[PDB]
C-alpha cells in the first residue's frame with residue numbers, strides 16, 4: 001500500500017554527498033527543514049543561489065511584518081498551515097525602491113492601500129506574491145516555507161554553516 | 167522466416183577490427199574459409215594458437231594421405247561432404263613417435279592394421295580422431311574443415327599472410 | 333563554415349520493417365534489439381529501450397541546456413539555435429586517439445530527423461516517456477506506432493500554473509488522473525479569497541497535487557517564473573535516460589521520497605561522486621559535472637534553472653560553484 | 658580468505674531478502690540491485706544484475722575477471738575468489754577508493770546462489786534473451802528456481818561417446834530454438850566395424866548448439882589436454898565484461914557478433930570487433946570484452962584451461978598475444 005514520504009520540521013532525513021574524487025562543498029548540500037528549524041521566525045535564509053536569484057527557506061511562526069517587492073515572488077508551503085494576506089498599495093514607490101530587487105521588510109504597521117485577499121496554504125501549496133502588493137503571514141504553529149525570489153535586503157546567507165563541508 | 171547464415175569456401179563475408187586505440191594485429195583476425203580456399207589440399211594451416219594447442223583450417227579435395235597422432239584430435243566439417251576412414255594400427259609406435267605431438271603425415275601407402283570404420287560428415291558435424299588410429303579423408307568436392315589439435319610436423323603457420331594488419 | 337542541414341530518409345528494411353536515417357555523416361539503423369549508429373570511421377550500438385528513452389528526452393526537451401549524453405559515447409550539445417551531435421566528444425579514450433567525431437547542425441534540421449526516428453522506431457504500446465512498469469516493450473520487428481505518446485504537448489507556465497490565460501491546473505476531467513505511485517498524496521486546493529476586483533492576482537494552487545498527476549517521467553516543466561529564475565518540477569521513476577552535463581549550475585530540491593545521483597566529470601566521464609537526496613534536500617549540480625538520477629519509487633523533484641543566455645559565456649571564464657562559501 | 662556470509666531480513670514492503678558477504682551488502686527493490694561496502698554504494702538495474710549473477714553462478718566464477726559492469730565484479734583464483742568494487746576503474750583506483758575482499762569460493766558461491774534464488778520471480782529466466790522470457794520488475798512474486806538451477810553440461814572427451822555427455826533431442830528435453838529453426842538436424846553417417854563401435858564417433862554439433870536452452874554459456878563439447886572447445890548460442894548482450902587471465906579465441910560459427918573491446922585494467926575502450934561466419938580472432942589477456950548479437954547466433958569459444966597461464970602472464974613468461982607477425 002503506497003506511502004509517499006514528505007519531510008517536516010519535526011521529521012526529516014537529511015541525505016548527502018559520498019565522495020569518489022571531488023570536494024563535497026561543490027554540491028552546496030543542505031536540507032530546507034533543518035535550515036528553517038534553526039533560523040529565527042520568518043528569517044529568510046538562502047538555501048539556493050544562482051547569480052542574483054535565490055531559493056530561501058523560512059519558519060513561519062505567529063504573524064510576520066509586512067513585505068513588498070519590485071518584482072513577482074512565489075511562496076511554497078512545505079509543512080503546515082500558513083495564512084497569506086495581500087494588500088494593494090496606493091503608492092508602492094513609498095515603501096519599495098523600484099530597481100531594487102528582493103523582498104523589502106516594510107514594517108509591522110498596516111501599509112496604506114486596499115484589502116486584496118486572503119490565501120490559506122497547506123503543505124505542497126504555492127501562491128503568487130505579485131509585484132505592487134504588500135504581503136504578510138500568519139502561522140498558528142511553526143510551519144516551513146520556501147520563497148522563489150532575488151538576493152536582497154532580507155536574504156540571509158549562512159553558506160558555510162548550513163551546507164555539508166565534510 | 168528465420169535464416170541462419172553459414173559460411174562456405176565459395177561464399178563468406180569477412181568482418182574485422184575497428185580501431186579506437188589499439189593495434190589490429192593483436193586480434194589475429196582471419197576467416198577459415200578464405201585460408202582454406204588458398205591452401206593446397208589437406209594442408210593444415212593454423213588459424214588459432216594458444217601455447218602448444220592449435221586450431222587448423224584446411225580444404226578437403228580428393229583423397230588425403232594417411233595421418234596418426236600420439237594424442238586425440240577432433241575434426242569439424244564446415245562446408246560440404248567429407249568422408250573419414252579409420253584404421254586401428256597394429257604398431258602405432260612404428261608410424262608415430264610416442265613422445266611427439268601434433269598430427270603426423272604417415273604416408274600415402276596403406277599402413278598395417280585393421281578396419282575401424284567409416285564416417286560421413288556434412289557441415290556442422292564433429293568427429294573423434296582417436297589416438298592410435300590412422301585416419302584418411304575423401305572429398306568428391308572441395309569442402310572445408312577444422313582440426314582441434316597441437317602444433318606438430320604437419321601444421322603450417324603464416325600469420326602475416328592471413329591476418330588483418332590494418 | 334556553416335552549420336549543416338543535410339538529413340535523409342533512407343530505405344525501409346524488408347524483414348525488420350524499420351526505416352533508417354541519415355543526419356550529416358551519421359546513420360541510424362534499428363533492428364530487433366539495438367540501435368546501430370555509424371559515422372565516418374566509427375560505429376556503436378545502444379540497446380533500443382535505452383536509446384528510445386534518451387531520444388524521447390532530447391526531442392521533448394528541445395535539446396535541453398548544454399550536453400545530453402545518451403551514454404558514454406553518443407549525444408548532443410545545445411548551442412540554442414544550433415546543435416552539435418557527437419561520437420566520443422566526452423570520452424577520453426576517443427579524444428586521446430583523435431577518434432571523436434563532431435557535426436554541427438541547424439537545430440530545426442536536426443530535430444526534424446530525431447522526431448522521424450522516434451516516430452518510426454516506436455511501436456504500439458511502447459511509451460518511451462514512462463517508467464518500465466507502466467508500459468510495454470520496444471523489442472522485435474516494426475509493429476504499429478505510438479505517435480501520441482511521443483507527440484505530447486510541452487507545458488510551460490508564463491507566470492504560474494492556474495493564473496488566467498496561463499497553463500491550467502491538472503484534473504481527472506482535463507485528462508490527468510493521479511499516478512498509481514502517488515495514490516495517497518492529498519489533492520485539496522488551498523483556500524483562495526479574493527476581494528472584488530482582484531481575482532486576477534490572488535492565486536494559489538496545490539503543486540504536489542499537480543506533480544502527482546504528471547503523466548511522464550524525467551520531464552522538467554515550468555510551474556513558476558521570476559525573470560530568468562525557473563521552477564521546473566517533474567515526476568521521477570527508474571533511471572534518468574541520459575547523463576546531463578549542464579553548461580551552468582542546476583539546482584535540485586527533492587520534494588518527496590529519494591533520488592541517488594551518479595555524478596561524473598563532464599569532460600572525461602570519470603566517476604566523481606554519488607549524491608543521495610531525501611525530502612527537503614537541496615543541492616547544486618556544478619557546470620563541471622554530468623549527472624544521472626536513480627529513483628526507485630516515483631518521486632517529486634524540483635529542478636530550479638537560471639534560464640539566462642548570458643551564463644554559458646561567463647561560466648567559461650568568470651565560476652562553476654555559484655556560491656561564495 | 659573470508660568465509661563469513663549471512664541472510665538478513667525479508668523486507669515487508671518488497672518481500673525480498675537482503676544478504677551479506679564480508680563487508681559487502683546486497684539489497685533489491687522493484688527496479689534495482691543495491692550494493693554497499695565499507696566506504697561506498699552502487700546501483701545496477703535488477704535485470705542487468707540477475708543476468709550477470711546468473712552467468713557468474715553457472716560458470717563457477719569463470720576464468721579471470723567477471724565485470725558485472727564498470728564498478729562491480731569478481732576475480733577467480735580457483736578455490737578462492739575476489740569480490741571487488743572499482744578495482745578496474747581508473748577513477749576509483751587513482752583515488753584509492755576501490756574495495757576488494759577475498760573469499761573461499763564455495764562460501765561466496767553459496768550466498769550468490771541464495772541471492773539469485775530470492776531475487777528471481779515467477780516467469781523471469783535470467784539465462785534467456787529478453788525476447789524469450791518475462792520481466793524482473795516489482796515486489797517478490799514466486800520464484801524461478803528451475804531456470805536458475807540447470808545442471809552445467811561438460812564433456813570429458815566428446816559429446817556422444819559411450820558414457821560421456823549426450824546428444825540433445827526433443828525427447829530428452831532440448832527442442833530447436835525458434836531462431837535456429839532452419840538448421841539441418843541429420844546426424845553424420847557413422848559406421849563402425851565390429852569391436853570398434855566405441856571409438857568410431859561423430860555428432861551434429863551445429864544441431865546440438867541450435868538446441869541450447871540458454872544464451873551466453875560456453876560449454877565443453879571436445880577436449881585435447883587443456884584445450885577445450887566451448888561453443889554456445891548467443892543472443893542480445895553478453896551480460897558481463899570478461900577480462901580473462903589468459904588469451905582466448907572466438908570462432909563465429911553462424912550469423913554475427915560485435916565485440917566491444919576495452920582495456921582490462923582501466924576500462925577505456927580500445928576497439929570494436931565484427932565477426933561473421935568463419936571469422937576467428939584472438940582476445941588478448943590485457944583486454945575485457947562484451948558481445949552484441951541481434952539474431953541468436955552460434956559462437957565457438959576456445960580455451961586453454963591450464964592453471965599455469967595466469968602467473969606466467971604476470972611474470973611475462975607467456976605473451977599477452979599468442980602470435981606476432
Ligand SMILES: [Fe+3]
Nearest residue numbers: 899901905946
Ligand atoms: Fe571471454
